[PDB]
Amino acid sequence: NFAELKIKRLRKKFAQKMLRKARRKLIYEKAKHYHKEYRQMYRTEIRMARMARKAGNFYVPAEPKLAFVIRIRGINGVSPKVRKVLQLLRLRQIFNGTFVKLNKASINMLRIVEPYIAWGYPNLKSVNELIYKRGYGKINKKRIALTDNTLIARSLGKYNIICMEDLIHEIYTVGKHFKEANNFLWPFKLSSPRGGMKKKTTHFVEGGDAGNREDQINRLIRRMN
Amino acid sequence: KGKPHCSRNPVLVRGIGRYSRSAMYSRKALYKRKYAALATVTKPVGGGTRVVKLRKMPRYYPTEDVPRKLLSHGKKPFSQHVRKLRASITPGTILIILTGRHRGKRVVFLKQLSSGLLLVTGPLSLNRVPLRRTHQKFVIATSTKIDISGVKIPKHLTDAYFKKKKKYEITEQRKVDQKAVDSQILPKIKAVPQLQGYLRSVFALTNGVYPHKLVF
């Protein structure tokens, strides 16, 4: 007869189509909520600074918890202690970038590889651009371009990370499942800095590029991305 | 059914409408528009009737055939492309032809054809320029224009009209149309002093003349 098989498979296809549409609405509203949270976070610091100034006191901003690190020096001539930490930071090729959370261990690691790296505090726009353009995902120890949300969902679904917006949200505002998401993200292959480096060998404090460029790292990313 | 209607969403930018999904839902008024639920021919033969089959099996099969290509979406044929013109080209302007046999001469521009080319024509009494097509890229447009909004070009000439046929011979209709358009263009250009002589003259580069510095 096949009259019931045809309608059954049509119902099954319609069911999964409805499920996909429900998921699309879910990620849309989650993105809206993340936008609202971003607005609240941005305005809160300004408001707290304003209320401290009007009272005469000071407001120390929260010390940054997320940093972006770029390997600016080549393979040749590297101390074994330095290169081991570079491997642990997944910075093998020159101009390779990654996100690292800040703690006592991380800061010491950045200090011990200070001459060979340039690290700073990226902002929301930098994270968005890096993830959308240069952001790939390590799927089955391969390098797959993140052209769809299912690629992120199949690997990070168990961490309540279903879309790229959730991934960016955790990367910016470090959550509980930050390590899995960061390890999923392949190291970023950034191009040479347009306009040129001021000085590679010297520290950024003494006019170079290497070192802790606190908020100036965004300028570097805008031209390296 | 119902009469087809235009889109209810004004275009904000390319691919983005001015009204959201819920607002457009209200505009469509979908809240009250819910819905729910060949190969053989008989032919008499003087015998009986024969069942003739159209689209018969191929008589020949090649040794091998190429596989079918994949499917793309944005690769539209040239007949339905969208055509654009430079901001300095308006009907009634003066153009400089640089490539064709009429190179270096100043010509009067009429309108944009359906083939994307510029329908240009100078007074044949002035610079020997018939009703001729020309390419937008291969033409320099100057800052000297005349108001031809009161003229009427014949509507029977198109890309097919100007398409090459196959020694070349001039048809009578070409001369008739050229005279018809000259009788409307030449008196208009003669209003502007020293314009006929400028059109008769040609464009050339001397020593110290540099296109980047000079403005036309």
Partner: peptide, 19 residues
């Protein structure tokens, strides 16, 4: 609703709602 196992009835009802 988006969860497959626990959202089946909700997706069924919204499907009926579209009809």
């Amino acid at each position: 609703i988006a969860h497959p196992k626990l959202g089946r009835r909700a997706r069924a009802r919204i499907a009926r709602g579209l009809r």
